[PDB]
Amino acid sequence: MALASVLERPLPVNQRGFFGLGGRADLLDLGPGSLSDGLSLAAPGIEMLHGTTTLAFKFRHGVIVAADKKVIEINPYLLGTMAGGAADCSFWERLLARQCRIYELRNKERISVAAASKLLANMVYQYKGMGLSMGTMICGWDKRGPGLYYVDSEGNRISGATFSVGSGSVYAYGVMDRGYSYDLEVEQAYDLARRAIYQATVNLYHVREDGWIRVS
Amino acid sequence: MFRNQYDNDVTVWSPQGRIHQIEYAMEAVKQGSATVGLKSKTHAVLVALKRAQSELAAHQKKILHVDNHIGISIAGLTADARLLCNFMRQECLDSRFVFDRPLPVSRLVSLIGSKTQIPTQRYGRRPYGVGLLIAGYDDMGPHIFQTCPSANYFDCRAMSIGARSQSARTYLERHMSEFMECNLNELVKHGLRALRETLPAEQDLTTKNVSIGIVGKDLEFTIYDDDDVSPFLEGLEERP
Amino acid sequence: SRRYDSRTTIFSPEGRLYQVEYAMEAIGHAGTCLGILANDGVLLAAERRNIHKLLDEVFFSEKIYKLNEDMACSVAGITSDANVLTNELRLIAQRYLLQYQEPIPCEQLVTALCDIKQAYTQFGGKRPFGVSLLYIGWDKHYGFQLYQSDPSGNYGGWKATCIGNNSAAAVSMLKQDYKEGEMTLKSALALAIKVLNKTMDVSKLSAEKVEIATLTRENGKTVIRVLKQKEVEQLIKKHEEEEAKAE
Amino acid sequence: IGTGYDLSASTFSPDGRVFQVEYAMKAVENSSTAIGIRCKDGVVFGVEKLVLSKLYEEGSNKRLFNVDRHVGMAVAGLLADARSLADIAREEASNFRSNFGYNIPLKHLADRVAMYVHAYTLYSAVRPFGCSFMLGSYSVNDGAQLYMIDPSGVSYGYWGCAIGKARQAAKTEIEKLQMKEMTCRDIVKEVAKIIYIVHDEVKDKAFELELSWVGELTNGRHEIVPKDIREEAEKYAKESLK
Amino acid sequence: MNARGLDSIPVTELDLLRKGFSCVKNELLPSHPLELSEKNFQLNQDKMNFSTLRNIQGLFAPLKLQMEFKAVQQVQRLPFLSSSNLSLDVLRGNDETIGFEDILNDPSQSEVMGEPHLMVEYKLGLL
Amino acid sequence: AATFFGEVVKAPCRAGTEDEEEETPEDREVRLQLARKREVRLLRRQTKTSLEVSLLEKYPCSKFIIAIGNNAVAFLSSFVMNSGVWEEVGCAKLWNEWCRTTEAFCVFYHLKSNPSVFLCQCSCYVAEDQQYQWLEKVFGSCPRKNMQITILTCRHVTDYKTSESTGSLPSPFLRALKTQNFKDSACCPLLEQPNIVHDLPAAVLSYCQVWKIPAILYLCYTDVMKLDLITVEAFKPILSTRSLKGLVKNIPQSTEILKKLMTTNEIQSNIYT
Amino acid sequence: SYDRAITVFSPDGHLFQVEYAQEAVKKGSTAVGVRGRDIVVLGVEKKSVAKLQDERTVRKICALDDNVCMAFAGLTADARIVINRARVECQSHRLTVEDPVTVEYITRYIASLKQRYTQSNGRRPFGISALIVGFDFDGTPRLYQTDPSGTYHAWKANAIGRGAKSVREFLEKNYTDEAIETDDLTIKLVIKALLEVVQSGGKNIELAVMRRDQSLKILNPEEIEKYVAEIEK
Amino acid sequence: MFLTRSEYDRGVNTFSPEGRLFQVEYAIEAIKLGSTAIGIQTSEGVCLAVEKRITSPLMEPSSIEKIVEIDAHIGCAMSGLIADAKTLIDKARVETQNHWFTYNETMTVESVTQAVSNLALQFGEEDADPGAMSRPFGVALLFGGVDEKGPQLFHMDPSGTFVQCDARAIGSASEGAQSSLQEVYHKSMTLKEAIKSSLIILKQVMEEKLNATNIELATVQPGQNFHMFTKEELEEVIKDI
Amino acid sequence: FSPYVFNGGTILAIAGEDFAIVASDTRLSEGFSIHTRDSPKCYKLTDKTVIGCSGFHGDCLTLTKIIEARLKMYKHSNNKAMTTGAIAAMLSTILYSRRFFPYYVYNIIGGLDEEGKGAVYSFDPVGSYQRDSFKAGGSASAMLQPLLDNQPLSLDRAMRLVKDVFISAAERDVYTGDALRICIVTKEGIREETVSL
């Protein structure tokens, strides 16, 4: 078996139990493997978030996101929202959190919102048309001030000061469009978010300089 | 004087029909510390002697765990021991997954020999510089096997390998006729007395330099270290 | 010394590449080539080595090659390697034209070939090309140009240079007879004839020992032509008459 | 004298010899002697097995393998190469049976294994094998057959063979037998007697006799000799030594 | 019979300018029934010859053929230049036949070619 | 060895002629500096000054004992020089690949009660081009008529030439080699024929044999070349000879010291288990 | 002996082939780099000038991106490959992260690429060393150095190539916070540092000056002569 | 009866007549060209002190740090070839984050050390995976962290083997530092005096002046993450030693 | 050729302050025919965790074998037995490894945590999971969840509740078995008993 080892290309012919055009070769390796990670090729009930409404807008003092859990705490300084397939959102945002931690360890500096959103969009764009379904809003604060982006499974990636996705999207968006103001105090912003989410039909988060907090 | 040309590779035969690199690799086994392995009608026992770099470092471990009914002991290099241990564990796991039965020790050791024979024939490789002692239990009872860097394995009833193991082998040969009737006690004691012959006449065995591995009819492979060894060391004599 | 000559991937104790040095030394045996840049054209003159009485003349030229509608080249070294390099240059030019729908610039072509030449001095088991090149051409970014390459993979742009046998004397004479910014095509031709006459000590020049190529721009087009024996004979006769009048 | 042309298996001596193969063949004479005798209705093997120490079991490191249901095998030389070649022979027999649905003839198996052995004496990336071996079989439609293969890759049919350290004396002893007209029961004793005669006790402390036949008695199967017959053969050999 | 031949989505947990314009869904299935058959003709032919030769003669023959192929296919030009494949064609038996791979889309006159060092590194397995 | 496929390689030579057969001011300066880098210097550690005269020329000598290797110096330190007053006279400084600094030392002592008895504990390695400088700086040019020299060292068992296997020998064991003028008899069998010994002890014996000085060399072939108790206990029979009869006084305390120092060994690289 | 294979250790633990490769850096033209507060200056001295040559094709200062520069000393043919790979990587990083590249990131990439060629006997290392300057995204000037062995580390002012010890000593003596007060002062400091080895300034010196939020700018002989005259005053 | 020349120390796959691999020994000897590092393991925490060599006042000290952060509870110290340690620290960090992603927990110091050591084992077989390295690494590492079993300290060797040490010193002055450590270490001791003793030994062994700028210090404690001392803390602890 | 076949089953889990209960039926069927009347769907993984799965039978067998192999691998590598949360995370990753060709299995994991309290996790065929106090799965989960919701407790009352829930559900379901198995996880180990139905 030393001559066959020199040829650095293991063919099924060189292995044991070979006869005819096939043989007892595909029935030999039936172990559970050692170590790897990879999705299976294409060929029941899948849990999906249907009756959920979310809301998020940014202003001078930070970013406020509210919903009806339905908010993923990626990092102490990064926040995310799920819409659609729960499993896909959880898996890909866990991958994003791991990537952010690797970046921080390597470069001794926290990643920015734009880079994180781009990384998530790049990961989810490879499987276009396969069947993935997710819609995410990413909140954070970095050296350039507050940031807010929207990423979905169709490759869309946009930035804005006001977003809303859910069953009651139209009503809440209209309310917070009527009541929006960039130079707004924290209390008035809380009141506006509460009123909008109430009219949509309650959680509440607030991202600041040094990480997010929970209001109610 | 005339050997300088034919002892630089394993792909070259000497004019006397000898491969000198295999004989050189067989000498790495004697660079370790002594190990003793014996068996009885029911149990199989491994005893090993541990060394330490200094008083502020933990003693290196010699007895490893392969499966619920197989354990090994190491004397030689370390990287080769780790690679072989990984191979053993993978083979046992695959066999159990596929057939829902434990893998026989004879088949396992045959696989080890077949894998180890290859690097002694092809270019760009070197032989494994490690010797092992294998203790297991299956439908045929206890088993003790020995492995050599020359891809040779033997089926023993009591064996010792390492540095200055001739005294242990002599003791085992002298006391061979009483092993098959002893229970676990006095069998661990015979092993310890055999291992004590590899030391200078002034010093003795403490609880910080001995390891014990036992596998039996209804007892899985277990390793006793540090304070777990005192019950076996209570009854020893004063090195007669 | 003799310990660090085995292959190309060995550094001398003072950081020297002896195999590349020997490959560059291999160029000193081939024929002599010249290149002169003028205000309204560029010039390229070479010495014929195949001069046996029983040889034939079948090809368009012996050492001058055409790579593109706007460029030409001359080789000095091993013919076998020169052929491969010429084919690769033509392929590279056609690839760029297909990609961008525009002719390739001269410096880009030179860099692309020099990368290939350098790749053989880094991976062991191969042998570097023993060829030097001289390039002439016209470009919409810089006009007329003249470049030179060597087996090491280096290159640079010149106004008047020389490669091959007896290169040092030719360079020394050019450095004192070339005047920047005031050279015309006739002056360049006369200077080339004089330099070739001085550097060829075999015998007196004859029209069958040299070949001269001229690149000029005429009515939005680049024309490359090889001078004929009549013109070469007139040039040599005029130079000889000038020398005779000098004394 | 072949100094300078004996460092690779792909180099020819000035008189047209390959010296690595010669050294490999020389390496076989470093092990004990094994013999095999073909008789009227079967083949019987015999190996002089040295004892290294008393700490080993009865059946450790044997030198008689079961290649197939009807084929035996005896080896000499480096043991690891012998195990590898036994695995190769088993694989070849299994492949033939799977393809064509009946027991492989002995000549074909010998040819396959001999060519596999020879393939190693052509390239500089490997080294020649260092072991010889013999094959034996019996069937009703073919009769007994015996073959030998050596490290160079040459196979031949034999009426009686011997490989190892003392093949010359063993061959001299064998050449005085009328094996064409006897029976396995009358050949086991002769094999044991020859093994005992050849053995040297000055340079070898002790040994254990190992025997096995194949033939009409075993109904075309390769088996180990029963213990009582081994004891009787050993007693007869010891008596004949005096 | 030589032309009839018989879960790999890794996640990076073991440059986008270099690779582009490719999705997993399109490459999941072939575009024509003859695509994979034509792309892997030589490999299938070699496999068929090895199978029949191993079944009839033994292990030595396919091993010797593969050893000869590997030895002779190590003295070629670097991958950014075109080779002739003389001795490999002689050994393989294709020195007196012309197929559709020779007269269509001459590989010696391809319209694309990458950087030298990149190809040499990719062939070595580093990238 | 070949670095690429089909490379042309040459066989190594055992006579060493393949390197010196090849025989700018910068090269000469480099050679001079490299030669100056690895010169042998003998100096007194008390004031850090070199001795311009050979060590044995300053002080008369009647007995000289040399130990080479860890085991030999350990044996001498435990058994001989634990029962007296010894003054350090000088030390040697060396540099080479295998001894970067000078665990590595070479220190000379002489007995206070009897200034005619000397000692030397060399644990470093002296290269092949520094042994003659060592001999010149220690012994000088003109030797002395009345002087006896004893040498001790250790060698691995695999260097022994025997018809049987190396592993079958009952290591450790002692062997001896003595010059013509050594009238006494050794306590161990003399070394067999096809076996030779080289390096520094060979240099000392060659000097003593050429210049007609009595000498003897003791060798220990062992299977453990580290600091071990069996190896240093194997040197016990030497104490019965006339060279060491008047220097040993208490055996049990030497054994206790040996046991004490056996517990402060150097840390071995964890390559073997 | 032990200095003919890349992957062979000396008995005292030395890899001599890499040191021999580094020895080739010490023969190239001197390069100087000084980091200011709002400016970064690179200076390379011309080893020799040939009157019949085009100076545009022999420059040793290159631009890797909008905010990164580079200057090398060593093997000219080997420098070009590294420069092209670095440019491709700089452009490819923006495709994955919208932010522009960072000086430490590009230095890490170059060092890893250099180290990849010292791991096998089938290829030889790159005989060059580089100085990299630039500005970060938030506006912090940087300066790094790379070695053929594959190591990098930051500096405030450094010199590589032949005759670098004297220049480094001069920079150590004459570097202070009041000498980098303004762009003119920084440029004059670089010129003064280079003048210690150049036999005659103005003709054997080339400078590249990069300001914050601006592209690379190459000074011309007129400006170089003006600065030389002002220094000589 | 002749003396001849024999060579066995120019290949990674060659055995000496006494079964010794000499290239690995030479790679181990290559460590002695680095800087001294000291690690003391105590029931209250782990201490890591290293000496950094400054070749010029123009360098940035914060760019040649020899103590890195593997994770929130694991440190590291380096000695030997700098370029080689950067391919092992990255492996350690990647393995830690992979384990966290898969199992939603944190690794142990022993597991991290084993995972790193699995990479240094493979060498000399270029016919295997193309990314395999043909020669041993020339760097030694010290690992220090806190886990379920309390504070831990590990040592890894270019041979690819690791043990656990109560107090270890590696680098150029390793033997002298170890001899001094053996005379001062005792189990019932506190972090402050561990710091003081390590600083004293470093001052004794260095060939320069200990001035709170040519050394760096770091500790990890139960309940607090990996922490590196600042300039003021270094000056305060270096005063009166 | 459909590579999926539905087999009946019903599983339940209740988490207590210092105990955990997992129960299931013991019937294997293919809609109309009855394969066996004795086939428990609760498997013991370690001394402190139990898993119960129902759905396609071959997928269940493969999943259990893979889980046991991974447990052995982790024990060998890390020199300790892995906890309940680690098992849950690993199972979620394993399940999502086959997103485009899913396992047709519903899992429920019950056991003790590090602090010594009950823990219950519920999954989906893709891998989403969360911690709960009580969960019902299987075919009859829809008609069984409201009963539990409208109805922590001690061990005896929880067992009483479990018995009445299964006896009420079996009479109204076509896939419930003829026997009920209950596994109790506590600090002293694990014990189980079978109740006839």
PDB file of N, CA, C and O in Angstrom, chain A residues 1-4 6 15-20 24, chain D residues 87-88 91 95 98-99 116 119-120 123 125-126:
ATOM      1  N   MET A   1       0.809  -1.219   0.000  1.00  0.00           N
ATOM      2  CA  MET A   1       0.000   0.000   0.000  1.00  0.00           C
ATOM      3  C   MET A   1       0.843   1.270   0.000  1.00  0.00           C
ATOM      4  O   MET A   1       0.328   2.361   0.222  1.00  0.00           O
ATOM      5  N   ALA A   2       2.141   1.125  -0.253  1.00  0.00           N
ATOM      6  CA  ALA A   2       3.027   2.274  -0.359  1.00  0.00           C
ATOM      7  C   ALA A   2       3.049   2.863  -1.759  1.00  0.00           C
ATOM      8  O   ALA A   2       3.239   4.075  -1.909  1.00  0.00           O
ATOM      9  N   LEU A   3       2.869   2.034  -2.789  1.00  0.00           N
ATOM     10  CA  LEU A   3       2.789   2.555  -4.148  1.00  0.00           C
ATOM     11  C   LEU A   3       1.517   3.365  -4.355  1.00  0.00           C
ATOM     12  O   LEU A   3       1.534   4.391  -5.041  1.00  0.00           O
ATOM     13  N   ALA A   4       0.403   2.918  -3.773  1.00  0.00           N
ATOM     14  CA  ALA A   4      -0.851   3.647  -3.919  1.00  0.00           C
ATOM     15  C   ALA A   4      -0.850   4.938  -3.113  1.00  0.00           C
ATOM     16  O   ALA A   4      -1.585   5.872  -3.444  1.00  0.00           O
ATOM     17  N   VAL A   6       1.768   6.939  -2.822  1.00  0.00           N
ATOM     18  CA  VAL A   6       2.571   7.929  -3.533  1.00  0.00           C
ATOM     19  C   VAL A   6       1.699   8.742  -4.480  1.00  0.00           C
ATOM     20  O   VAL A   6       1.835   9.967  -4.573  1.00  0.00           O
ATOM     21  N   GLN A  15      -9.059   1.464  -3.838  1.00  0.00           N
ATOM     22  CA  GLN A  15      -9.524   1.078  -2.516  1.00  0.00           C
ATOM     23  C   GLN A  15      -9.888  -0.405  -2.490  1.00  0.00           C
ATOM     24  O   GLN A  15      -9.803  -1.115  -3.495  1.00  0.00           O
ATOM     25  N   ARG A  16     -10.301  -0.874  -1.320  1.00  0.00           N
ATOM     26  CA  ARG A  16     -10.618  -2.278  -1.118  1.00  0.00           C
ATOM     27  C   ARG A  16     -12.075  -2.550  -1.482  1.00  0.00           C
ATOM     28  O   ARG A  16     -12.905  -1.641  -1.547  1.00  0.00           O
ATOM     29  N   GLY A  17     -12.377  -3.822  -1.717  1.00  0.00           N
ATOM     30  CA  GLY A  17     -13.745  -4.218  -2.018  1.00  0.00           C
ATOM     31  C   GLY A  17     -14.287  -3.654  -3.313  1.00  0.00           C
ATOM     32  O   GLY A  17     -15.439  -3.208  -3.358  1.00  0.00           O
ATOM     33  N   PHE A  18     -13.483  -3.668  -4.371  1.00  0.00           N
ATOM     34  CA  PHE A  18     -13.872  -3.139  -5.670  1.00  0.00           C
ATOM     35  C   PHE A  18     -14.032  -4.285  -6.657  1.00  0.00           C
ATOM     36  O   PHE A  18     -13.125  -5.109  -6.807  1.00  0.00           O
ATOM     37  N   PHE A  19     -15.181  -4.335  -7.326  1.00  0.00           N
ATOM     38  CA  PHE A  19     -15.423  -5.328  -8.360  1.00  0.00           C
ATOM     39  C   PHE A  19     -16.431  -4.768  -9.352  1.00  0.00           C
ATOM     40  O   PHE A  19     -17.318  -3.995  -8.984  1.00  0.00           O
ATOM     41  N   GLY A  20     -16.288  -5.167 -10.610  1.00  0.00           N
ATOM     42  CA  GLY A  20     -17.181  -4.660 -11.628  1.00  0.00           C
ATOM     43  C   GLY A  20     -16.997  -3.168 -11.829  1.00  0.00           C
ATOM     44  O   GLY A  20     -15.919  -2.608 -11.611  1.00  0.00           O
ATOM     45  N   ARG A  24     -18.527  -3.049  -3.423  1.00  0.00           N
ATOM     46  CA  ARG A  24     -18.732  -2.729  -2.019  1.00  0.00           C
ATOM     47  C   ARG A  24     -17.862  -1.545  -1.623  1.00  0.00           C
ATOM     48  O   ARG A  24     -17.092  -1.628  -0.663  1.00  0.00           O
TER      49      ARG A  24
ATOM     50  N   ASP D  87      -2.444  -9.642   2.937  1.00  0.00           N
ATOM     51  CA  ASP D  87      -3.626  -8.820   2.688  1.00  0.00           C
ATOM     52  C   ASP D  87      -3.887  -8.678   1.195  1.00  0.00           C
ATOM     53  O   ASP D  87      -5.037  -8.765   0.742  1.00  0.00           O
ATOM     54  N   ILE D  88      -2.828  -8.461   0.414  1.00  0.00           N
ATOM     55  CA  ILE D  88      -2.987  -8.326  -1.033  1.00  0.00           C
ATOM     56  C   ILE D  88      -3.571  -9.601  -1.631  1.00  0.00           C
ATOM     57  O   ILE D  88      -4.480  -9.550  -2.471  1.00  0.00           O
ATOM     58  N   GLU D  91      -7.264  -9.929  -0.858  1.00  0.00           N
ATOM     59  CA  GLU D  91      -8.059  -9.019  -1.676  1.00  0.00           C
ATOM     60  C   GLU D  91      -8.209  -9.541  -3.099  1.00  0.00           C
ATOM     61  O   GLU D  91      -9.296  -9.458  -3.685  1.00  0.00           O
ATOM     62  N   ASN D  95     -11.773 -10.472  -4.853  1.00  0.00           N
ATOM     63  CA  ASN D  95     -12.210  -9.777  -6.060  1.00  0.00           C
ATOM     64  C   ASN D  95     -12.550 -10.759  -7.172  1.00  0.00           C
ATOM     65  O   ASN D  95     -13.562 -10.594  -7.864  1.00  0.00           O
ATOM     66  N   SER D  98     -15.869 -12.464  -6.374  1.00  0.00           N
ATOM     67  CA  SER D  98     -16.992 -11.554  -6.573  1.00  0.00           C
ATOM     68  C   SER D  98     -17.289 -11.344  -8.052  1.00  0.00           C
ATOM     69  O   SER D  98     -18.456 -11.272  -8.449  1.00  0.00           O
ATOM     70  N   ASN D  99     -16.250 -11.228  -8.881  1.00  0.00           N
ATOM     71  CA  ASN D  99     -16.472 -10.975 -10.302  1.00  0.00           C
ATOM     72  C   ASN D  99     -17.064 -12.190 -11.005  1.00  0.00           C
ATOM     73  O   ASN D  99     -18.047 -12.069 -11.744  1.00  0.00           O
ATOM     74  N   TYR D 116       2.427  -7.967  -8.822  1.00  0.00           N
ATOM     75  CA  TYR D 116       2.368  -6.887  -7.841  1.00  0.00           C
ATOM     76  C   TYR D 116       3.701  -6.714  -7.127  1.00  0.00           C
ATOM     77  O   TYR D 116       4.129  -5.587  -6.865  1.00  0.00           O
ATOM     78  N   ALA D 119       6.271  -5.031  -9.481  1.00  0.00           N
ATOM     79  CA  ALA D 119       6.056  -3.617  -9.778  1.00  0.00           C
ATOM     80  C   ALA D 119       6.863  -2.692  -8.877  1.00  0.00           C
ATOM     81  O   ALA D 119       7.032  -1.517  -9.214  1.00  0.00           O
ATOM     82  N   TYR D 120       7.357  -3.183  -7.741  1.00  0.00           N
ATOM     83  CA  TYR D 120       8.086  -2.343  -6.799  1.00  0.00           C
ATOM     84  C   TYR D 120       9.562  -2.191  -7.136  1.00  0.00           C
ATOM     85  O   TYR D 120      10.231  -1.349  -6.533  1.00  0.00           O
ATOM     86  N   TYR D 123      10.729   1.711  -9.740  1.00  0.00           N
ATOM     87  CA  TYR D 123      10.699   3.135  -9.463  1.00  0.00           C
ATOM     88  C   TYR D 123      11.621   3.467  -8.299  1.00  0.00           C
ATOM     89  O   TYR D 123      11.946   2.612  -7.473  1.00  0.00           O
ATOM     90  N   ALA D 125      10.816   5.776  -6.050  1.00  0.00           N
ATOM     91  CA  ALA D 125      10.008   6.286  -4.953  1.00  0.00           C
ATOM     92  C   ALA D 125       9.666   5.229  -3.914  1.00  0.00           C
ATOM     93  O   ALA D 125       9.117   5.575  -2.865  1.00  0.00           O
ATOM     94  N   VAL D 126       9.968   3.960  -4.175  1.00  0.00           N
ATOM     95  CA  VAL D 126       9.695   2.859  -3.264  1.00  0.00           C
ATOM     96  C   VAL D 126      10.899   1.925  -3.263  1.00  0.00           C
ATOM     97  O   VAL D 126      11.871   2.132  -3.992  1.00  0.00           O
TER      98      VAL D 126
END
